[PDB]
Symmetry: D2
Subunit: 510 residues, 4 copies
């Protein structure tokens, strides 16, 4: 209601309650702490929309049992078809890696190195058994060609740094920049450097194949560097996983610099904030995050942002005081879902963490100046002749003017709800579908609430359409989005099929 | 396409053609020069939308023959039901008046008066036969109570002015401010003064009754001063002329000062620019005109503006050079129709004058910054729960985005087309009706093109609706507003009746 | 004070008085009706700022006596140095022309031609004595090369039109499009055609030389077609008339099409609306003015607009009712001065016409939405490092905030006042100069009020500056722009010379 | 340079360097870790502007030795008068408190209480020696009157919560809501409750007196609840500390609800984020912070925000990874200085923490859309007649247009620099003063860089002014804000004294 952003901030009140609807999606990692059909059932009630499986750890037998358990808890509530809530399954690839050899043969032995000490790095397979505080063997056979003189090298999550001093054929002579402890099989990161590793490793061709067979909703693709890498993943999923959404993880200088070509090839972005903060300096990661959420909002594409719980540095008191400034930040920046990794996989209090994500996410929607955003998105939209685009703009403007409580949209592929949601209307968008995969992927887009319809297809089509609209109005009242004698916008097509949405009706709630 | 008003003006090109559609209505007065079924037929082709009858002159027998002739020429073209054009009939009341008595008994005698000479004005009926250059008799019996000391009096269209010097009971002693010639039965105007004459004269109760019997489309009400005067006219039309549109003429200081209460009571305003320029000083009439067109645009109510042809003051060349700056001004100010009085009633070249109004009106729509106007009207619109208002805002926004070539609206009373037109969309608004009175009144609102449908009501209602939409698409292509494989917005209701408009479809032209 | 343009129009009141200051300049033509030192003295009091001399008529002896008389009336008021008002002298060239030969030898004989009749046009000098209703001789020797087949020709101010039928070497065979009367020595106009006549005629090289010798303030240059024509005039004025302002008259399709290159070469534009309306169709002249005033406002260059008095076409009443819609239009479009030709040269009531221009000009400044204009001009201004530009922007913004009643500027060439005036501040701009030519040219720019200072240059410079500021504050209070204990902005430089303005002080009026 | 906020975010680049100037102030707490003249000297170089002394701990003898040491390190650099940097001293009151009695007589004994157990709270002084797990003695004698039935009570930083069950005269019977350990002399907090404690305690009347004697720059006032409390502090400082800035700490529901009356009475606000998060729920503190920074920007008053360093909750790696999202947030919200408490008082690496605050603060100024802020502040500014206000608006607008590198302002009280800084110009504001207290307080306002001038007052005043301007231009070039042949705005008055600023000059850098 404010004319300015400064007025808007000045009128924030702490003695007023929020709405029931929570626009932002919640993604939880599943490990040993929460693999069980009783823990799962309880997180679904707390507000979990997506379950992420991390294919770094475990085998294919172990994961298949987590998927089975995720589906069992989901289907428990498929008895009251009004209060059923769909839940997606995603798959994080391990992704292409560079690793050191075994230290002193054993693998449990640790050799400590001091600042200044020059060491040689060798690519020859003789030294892969015995690495000492003078010779390190790396798995990467092309490191010499990608590295330059003056380039830095990080060993094990940026604990040890090496300055490149002398560049030679099949060997590198390096000064030591930081002191730490070298263990066996530790990961290597090469800042600045435009790495030449393949798009998919030999291991991930097997995991991408396992996911298509296990019928997953989306794939998180690690270490994306160019638009050709995204194209590679799409070939491996084949024509049998052609519906599976590819989300590109951005996690080095190069993928940041070449962002615009990746965005175009992908189905959505993830800003892997831990990973990005090893390669990029800490105070620059802050800016790179806002730039990527900004560009994803302007293109109408979903952007996941991977967060953490923080605590105070000086700790005298006993309580943990789980500080969720990190989470609230992203909601405000205009992220579509937020992710919690460790806190839900191996941590001690999983339910408590989902309940925190929820309560923060809900409250922080108050502080956005939604009006400025909404106008702004409508200006950078092109004139077209596509009937569907024009229906959507009509629906969104009607909805301001009558202060409607919901926009109902019938959809098969999800595409018609996606066009409405790119404007960020105030009103919740209910999508009514029969396709069960479409109801799952809908959690990626901010402000869409999917409802799946189970009923048998009626004889007359006009009569089928009127059944799915009514279903949607019951589910709306049950979940408390509007009551009787309110106004809703309803959006549909003229014939059966995908791509024919063209009608907008303004109706009273029965 | 310009961001500013200054850019907009700088990009005007004189080597580019205009569109075929002319948004502004054209009202012509009918007198002896153009009472004939051959002259009438020819003005209808030139672009005449309304025929005005002036009830100052003629009798009731004479006017009834003009109406008959207007209808005959109209119905001549009702053979090709696609190219038929409806034509309204309006009625200008004579309106309440003050007149002087006979000069020197004869009525043809003229007595000239010089500056300074004090004369008496008497209300007593003895002097009504013989008025001299010392005693004038006026018809108004309450002039003494409404006039003050220092008030001016205008005799015969502001030729002679009288300053009030001495105020007495039943007599006025007046200095002479301007010299001229006094004739017999000349009209009196009293600037500043809040006159007490009745709302309708004894003559106009008879004319308002004649018009209801003759089935006229709208009534022009003279000398409106307050919102009670408008209410009086509405009682005389009764409940048998309850559809007849009342347009209030504004023609004195008081009606200007009390504008906002009249606007609310009326169906539209007319800015009688000749009349207003006798009572108000010449350089103030300019401002009073813009203020009233402004307020009528903001309220969503039509405003007629009565204009003239001008010529150059110093005339050496033989051509008349009909200067239409007066006409172009009003189109730009945001008038809905323009009127031409004398040029069409008694003048020598009637067709030429209608062809001029048309050509000016068309061209001057180029110079309006339509974008600034359109945004501006949408901001000063209130949030409601009325389904119809929300349908209309939806239709208008859809129409920008797809660059549609027309908005088709089905209507009975005209009300649904009126709501769309209050936004001033770029696209022409086609109204499809069966009601023949509704198609006539549609000429008052800027940018609506009425089409009347003659076909018999089909059995199934859904099938009736689809017939009137198609009719509208043929008439659209014939008149050349869009071709095949263009996009149109269509706007309709869910059941038969008035007040149920709620649906908006975006369709390809068949 | 309004947020919108529609609110602004709705709040116009007819019961409120205007300010004393009149921003727009008034240019009067001087002929026989007003050549006299008594008529002149009286127009100077009425509000005449510039006296135009038309070098079509009269000789060099006759004009030199008008100039002498203009200066005598001016200097009459140079006794009270506070109430003195400076007055410019301008010079309208006759400009390059094409004329027909003598009809039937006599020159007073007239031959009438009917529609259809083919006539030959010959360039050979044998027929220049005897022109008949079959053979016309034209002065232009290159007409054959500039004209095309299908091109039209206008003879004597567009009375007769000729369609080109057959094109031959040294002869033209032409159909007759309009019928009229051919006289002797009538002017020829060639629409569309990119004419090849020289920039200055042999006569105007003599008049431009006479004006430099007579010390005129500005030259009006007729029939400008390209940026090379303007350069030609500048060479003829030499280096002795290098201060004289060149105003380019625009009066054909070509000068309109090539506008942007002329504007850059000129000191200001004149939109000769009579002349432009012979060559261009009547309803297009409307747009072409408007485009040119718009571009002149954006470039910060003055634009004169030449107007007329109009009267009603159907005239039954005795009063002339001098209709000044033409004049009010231009003030609103954003013209800097307005001109009146015939009404002041040969007409019967010269004083009455100057008093009309004044009263209209003053009143019509009420209806401009000055806020939208002002913001708009500030956005399309480039970042520079010029101290003077930054001083000016500072002065104008300070002046809003304190609601100052005047901006005082010391100037030698006029350039520092010109930079302030390009923003169109609300407050009057007083320019204080010693240069008498600078005080004269200041009437071209909208909103500058020049004051000339006659006092002897004081010894200490700082003390000189403080004398000219005070002079300016007396003249301001006398003319009633502000009273004692008001606030003014004062603008000056750090050293003597041109080009050093850099200081802005906010002072209380003493 | 962007038209929108969404464009602005999309154009953020991570391969571009920041400016040298850091707009936001840095406040450090001084304890045992950094009381030494060698540690102090080193933090001054790192970017410390204010040294805070916490009057909870220590005696008056101990603090007087910290002040002495702060001044010694400051004055070390007063040898090169160009590179000297002034440093303020502030004083945080302990503030009014409620405390429990001794547990079981000893004071080191702890009694643990379980959920459910009803305990009595007694105000009678018999039980103040022996408190058990049934009877607690509180210092507050009016708790019964301020508390209601259903009100909660927090004991020792919200470890234990008590629900009020039964309300009686001089006793409270309370359910236990949370279990913990009760110690001796633990602080009590009463949410919702409009507490009646005095404005200043008996201890703080002594500390406020010590600070006036020790010549401190500003006083931080704890537990402000109403505009009368601020008035009380102002009386105790007397008329000998009338220049000392009062900053009101906001730290309960009441002070938040009554914010607008406090702001008006104060010299600036501090948002004590730790303290506020005990009384208010965690997810509401987030909003209350943005509301208060918003209101302080709109009123032109400085707002300090007290922050912390955070670390990741799940910690497997060895590095601390000092997460400064908390700090970056506040800079973006539009805080004027940021504070670090523990990290600098008792922590192990003080220098490292100041270097972190600096590096974050600098970088996060990149992401603000400074243009939208700047326009926004100029719209909500009132028209006045104050010369100084108009000079300031002039200076700020000039400065955009010429892209100046600095605004130099001469000031005695600081007031003229404060008016410029309330607009938030892009260019740094250098304030040149002789008053040493004025140079210290200047660190509170965002974007002002004070320079103190030590030279002797010259004879001619005009010549004094020209010396202080030049000093300011040397100091500007040394610190690298502009080089030779750049442009600066300079702002000064017409006579000596406070309150006469009226002149603005645009000068080239010598």
């Amino acid at each position: 209601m404010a004319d300015t952003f400064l007025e808007h901030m000045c009128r924030l009140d702490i003695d007023s309650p929020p709405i029931t609807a929570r626009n932002t999606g919640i993604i939880c990692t599943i490990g040993p702490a929460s693999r069980s059909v009783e823990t799962l059932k309880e997180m679904i009630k707390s507000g979990m929309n997506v379950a992420r499986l991390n294919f770094s750890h475990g085998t294919h037998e172990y994961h298949a049992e987590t998927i089975k358990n995720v589906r069992t808890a989901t289907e428990s509530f498929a008895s009251d078809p009004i209060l059923y809530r769909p839940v997606a399954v995603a798959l994080d690839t391990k992704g292409p890696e560079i690793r050191t050899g075994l230290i002193k043969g054993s693998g449990t032995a640790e050799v400590e190195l001091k600042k200044g000490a020059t060491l040689k790095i060798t690519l020859d397979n003789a030294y892969m058994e015995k690495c000492d505080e003078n010779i390190l063997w790396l798995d990467y056979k092309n490191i010499c060609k990608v590295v330059e003189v003056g380039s830095k090298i990080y060993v094990d999550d940026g604990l040890i740094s090496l300055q490149v001093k002398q560049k030679g054929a099949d060997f590198l002579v390096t000064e030591v920049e930081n002191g730490g402890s070298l263990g066996s099989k530790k990961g290597v990161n090469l800042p600045g450097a435009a790495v030449d590793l393949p798009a998919v490793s030999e291991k991930d061709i097997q995991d991408l194949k396992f996911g298509v067979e296990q019928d997953v909703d989306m794939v998180f693709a690690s270490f994306i560097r160019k638009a050709s890498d995204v194209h590679e993943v799409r070939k491996v999923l084949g024509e049998k996983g052609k519906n599976i959404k590819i989300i590109s993880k951005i996690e080095n200088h190069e993928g940041v610099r070449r962002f615009d070509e990746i965005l175009e090839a992908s189905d959505g972005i993830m800003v892997a904030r831990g990973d990005l903060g090893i390669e990029i300096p800490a105070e620059k990661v802050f800016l790179a995050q806002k730039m990527m959420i900004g560009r994803c909002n302007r293109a109408g594409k979903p952007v996941i942002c991977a967060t953490q719980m923080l605590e105070s540095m000086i700790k005298k008191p006993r309580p943990t005081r789980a500080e969720g400034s990190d989470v609230a930040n992203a909601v405000l920046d205009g992220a579509d879902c937020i992710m919690l990794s460790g806190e839900t996989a191996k941590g001690d209090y999983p339910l408590e963490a989902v309940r925190m994500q929820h309560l923060i996410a809900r409250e922080a929607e108050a502080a956005i100046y939604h009006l400025q955003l909404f106008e702004e998105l409508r200006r950078l939209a092109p004139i077209t002749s596509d009937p569907t685009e024009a229906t959507a703009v009509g629906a969104v403007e009607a909805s301001f003017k009558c202060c409607s409580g919901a926009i109902i949209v019938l959809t098969k592929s999800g595409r018609s709800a996606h066009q409405v949601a790119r404007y960020r209307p105030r009103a919740p968008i209910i999508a009514v579908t029969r396709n069960p995969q479409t109801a799952r992927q809908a959690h990626l887009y901010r402000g869409i609430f999917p409802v799946l319809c189970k009923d048998p297809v009626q004889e007359a089509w006009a009569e089928d359409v009127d059944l799915r609209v009514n279903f949607a109005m019951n589910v709306g009242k049950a979940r408390g989005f509007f009551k009787k004698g309110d106004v809703v916008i309803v959006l549909t097509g003229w014939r059966p099929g995908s791509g024919f949405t063209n009608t907008m009706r303004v109706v009273p709630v029965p």
